[PDB]
Write an enzyme that holds these catalytic residues in place. Structure first.
Site, PDB file in Angstrom:
ATOM      1  N   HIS A   1     -41.342  13.996-131.572  1.00 15.83           N
ATOM      2  CA  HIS A   1     -42.428  13.549-130.704  1.00 15.83           C
ATOM      3  C   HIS A   1     -43.499  12.819-131.505  1.00 15.83           C
ATOM      4  CE1 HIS A   1     -45.816  13.533-127.933  1.00 15.83           C
ATOM      5  NE2 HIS A   1     -46.492  14.308-128.763  1.00 15.83           N
TER       6      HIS A   1
ATOM      7  N   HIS B   1     -46.114   9.069-131.139  1.00 18.40           N
ATOM      8  CA  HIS B   1     -47.489   8.792-131.569  1.00 18.40           C
ATOM      9  C   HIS B   1     -47.640   7.684-132.598  1.00 18.40           C
ATOM     10  CE1 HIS B   1     -49.840  11.840-129.494  1.00 18.40           C
ATOM     11  NE2 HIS B   1     -48.834  12.677-129.671  1.00 18.40           N
TER      12      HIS B   1
ATOM     13  N   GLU C   1     -51.408  10.829-124.563  1.00 17.08           N
ATOM     14  CA  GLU C   1     -50.149  11.559-124.385  1.00 17.08           C
ATOM     15  C   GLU C   1     -49.310  11.085-123.189  1.00 17.08           C
ATOM     16  OE1 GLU C   1     -48.855  13.702-126.587  1.00 17.08           O
ATOM     17  OE2 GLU C   1     -50.578  14.254-127.806  1.00 17.08           O
TER      18      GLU C   1
ATOM     19  N   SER D   1     -41.437  10.102-126.007  1.00 15.67           N
ATOM     20  CA  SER D   1     -40.489  10.977-126.698  1.00 15.67           C
ATOM     21  C   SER D   1     -39.739  11.881-125.727  1.00 15.67           C
ATOM     22  CB  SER D   1     -41.201  11.838-127.755  1.00 15.67           C
ATOM     23  OG  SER D   1     -42.090  12.768-127.157  1.00 15.67           O
TER      24      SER D   1
HETATM   25  C1  LIG Z   1     -56.077  17.869-126.903  1.00 15.00           C
HETATM   26  C2  LIG Z   1     -55.069  18.974-126.570  1.00 15.00           C
HETATM   27  N1  LIG Z   1     -54.635  19.673-127.798  1.00 15.00           N
HETATM   28  C3  LIG Z   1     -55.335  20.720-128.238  1.00 15.00           C
HETATM   29  O1  LIG Z   1     -56.330  21.085-127.616  1.00 15.00           O
HETATM   30  N2  LIG Z   1     -54.934  21.379-129.399  1.00 15.00           N
HETATM   31  C4  LIG Z   1     -53.798  20.924-130.063  1.00 15.00           C
HETATM   32  O2  LIG Z   1     -53.450  21.515-131.090  1.00 15.00           O
HETATM   33  C5  LIG Z   1     -53.125  19.865-129.575  1.00 15.00           C
HETATM   34  C6  LIG Z   1     -53.547  19.253-128.455  1.00 15.00           C
HETATM   35  N3  LIG Z   1     -52.722  18.246-128.173  1.00 15.00           N
HETATM   36  C7  LIG Z   1     -51.792  18.242-129.115  1.00 15.00           C
HETATM   37  C8  LIG Z   1     -50.642  17.228-129.192  1.00 15.00           C
HETATM   38  C9  LIG Z   1     -49.557  17.418-128.118  1.00 15.00           C
HETATM   39  C10 LIG Z   1     -49.367  18.463-127.311  1.00 15.00           C
HETATM   40  N4  LIG Z   1     -48.289  18.164-126.563  1.00 15.00           N
HETATM   41  C11 LIG Z   1     -47.840  16.951-126.912  1.00 15.00           C
HETATM   42  N5  LIG Z   1     -48.625  16.497-127.882  1.00 15.00           N
HETATM   43  C12 LIG Z   1     -46.713  16.361-126.302  1.00 15.00           C
HETATM   44  C13 LIG Z   1     -46.428  16.990-124.939  1.00 15.00           C
HETATM   45  C14 LIG Z   1     -46.308  18.493-125.135  1.00 15.00           C
HETATM   46  C15 LIG Z   1     -47.692  19.013-125.504  1.00 15.00           C
HETATM   47  N6  LIG Z   1     -52.015  19.226-129.986  1.00 15.00           N
HETATM   48  C16 LIG Z   1     -51.180  19.512-131.191  1.00 15.00           C
HETATM   49  C17 LIG Z   1     -50.335  20.621-131.037  1.00 15.00           C
HETATM   50  C18 LIG Z   1     -50.161  21.261-129.810  1.00 15.00           C
HETATM   51  C19 LIG Z   1     -49.307  22.359-129.701  1.00 15.00           C
HETATM   52  C20 LIG Z   1     -48.622  22.817-130.824  1.00 15.00           C
HETATM   53  C21 LIG Z   1     -47.746  23.899-130.741  1.00 15.00           C
HETATM   54  C22 LIG Z   1     -46.725  24.016-131.681  1.00 15.00           C
HETATM   55  C23 LIG Z   1     -45.825  25.075-131.619  1.00 15.00           C
HETATM   56  C24 LIG Z   1     -45.942  26.024-130.608  1.00 15.00           C
HETATM   57  C25 LIG Z   1     -46.955  25.906-129.662  1.00 15.00           C
HETATM   58  C26 LIG Z   1     -47.853  24.843-129.724  1.00 15.00           C
HETATM   59  C27 LIG Z   1     -48.789  22.175-132.045  1.00 15.00           C
HETATM   60  C28 LIG Z   1     -49.644  21.083-132.153  1.00 15.00           C
HETATM   61 FE   LIG Z   2     -48.559  14.513-128.743  1.00 12.40          FE
END
Ligand SMILES: CCn1c(=O)[nH]c(=O)c2c1nc(Cc1cn3c(n1)CCCC3)n2Cc1ccc(-c2ccccc2)cc1
Ligand SMILES: [Fe+3]
Length: 291
Positions: free
Chosen positions: A169, A174, A214, A233
């Protein structure tokens, strides 16, 4: 009063480890939940990120044959869709990544190489992250053009498993847009707006981030195109977003920030930006009203 925020890029050392949910903490429904070998592997990756400090070269990883095959499957299918689905800027930068960062079906790019590429192109760099951070901490990275980035690969049993980010992803969704100056500026300004902002403001910025960075759509030469990384992705939702089955609304931060961010399903609505430049202008107007 104003909460602590990072004042320089190395200050991300102090919040990037404020992990709320570690990457080894698999969801009950995760494809790897019962896979002990995968769980150890996820531990290995989380520890790499936890031990990382700003200034470090991002540790290189020897990906397994299984991991590379998973990447290859995802890479091959998505690349069939990008020419008819992805935005201008995405399509322009993807070939550069094949050339300089080793993007190929049989090779997973290293975060260090990708980070060095981004630094030269737009000043963006990558930081490996152990797991989920607060919206405040995650967005604060963007203020210094730092993208917090997962390093592990999704479980091989379901190359189509999307509710958590993995490095597929990050690299396919990104990175190509972080290489675009207009998009890099847009992203940085989300982070800058978030620094020291109220809890309320951070949450609204996070939702705007979600429906642009996203899951955003944009209009280019009269056509709807995709720029959201979560779409770029995800094979199934990429197709869905540009089908007639999707509901689309203009990007408008005061309205967009009211929208719920869905996790285990397709989004209920997508927001269309006119351009990265217009989206940036709209956020500037919006942030004045909340900070
Ligand atoms: C602004 C919201 N926002 C936040 O508040 N905090 C973030 O940490 C965040 C985020 N957003 C993204 C990036 C992200 C989150 N997602 C995606 N990209 C693709 C679609 C599925 C969810 N992240 C990064 C991130 C998010 C989740 C994980 C994660 C890894 C393993 C298990 C469970 C969670 C790891 C990194
Ligand atoms: Fe993301």
């Amino acid at each position: 009063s104003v909460p602590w925020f990072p004042k320089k890029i190395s200050d991300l050392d102090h919040c990037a480890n404020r992990v709320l949910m570690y990457g080894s903490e698999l969801d009950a429904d995760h494809p790897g939940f019962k896979d002990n070998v995968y769980r150890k592997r996820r531990k290995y990756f989380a520890d790499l990120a936890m031990n990382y400090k700003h200034g470090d070269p991002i540790p290189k990883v020897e990906f397994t044959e299984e991991e590379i095959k998973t990447w290859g499957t995802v890479f091959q299918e998505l690349n069939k869709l990008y020419p008819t689905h992805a935005c201008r800027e995405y399509l322009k930068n993807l070939p550069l990544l094949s050339k300089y960062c080793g993007y190929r079906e049989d090779n997973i790019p290293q975060l260090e190489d990708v980070s060095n590429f981004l630094k030269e192109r737009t000043g963006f760099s990558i930081r490996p992250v152990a797991g989920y951070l607060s919206p405040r901490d995650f967005l604060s990275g963007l203020a210094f053009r730092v993208f917090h980035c997962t390093q592990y690969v999704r479980h091989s049993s379901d190359p189509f498993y999307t509710p958590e980010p993995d490095t597929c992803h990050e690299l396919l969704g990104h990175v190509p847009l972080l290489a675009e100056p207009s998009f890099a500026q847009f992203s940085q300004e989300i982070g800058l707006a978030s620094l020291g902002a109220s809890e309320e403001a951070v949450q609204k910025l996070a939702t705007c981030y979600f429906f642009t960075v996203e899951f955003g759509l944009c209009k280019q030469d009269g056509q709807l195109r995709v720029f959201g990384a979560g779409l770029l992705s995800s094979i199934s939702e990429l197709k869905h977003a540009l089908s007639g089955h999707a509901k689309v609304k203009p990007f408008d931060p005061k309205i967009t920030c009211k929208q719920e961010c869905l996790i285990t399903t397709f989004q209920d609505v997508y927001f269309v930006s006119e351009s990265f430049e217009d989206a940036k202008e709209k956020m500037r107007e919006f942030t004045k009203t909340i900070k």
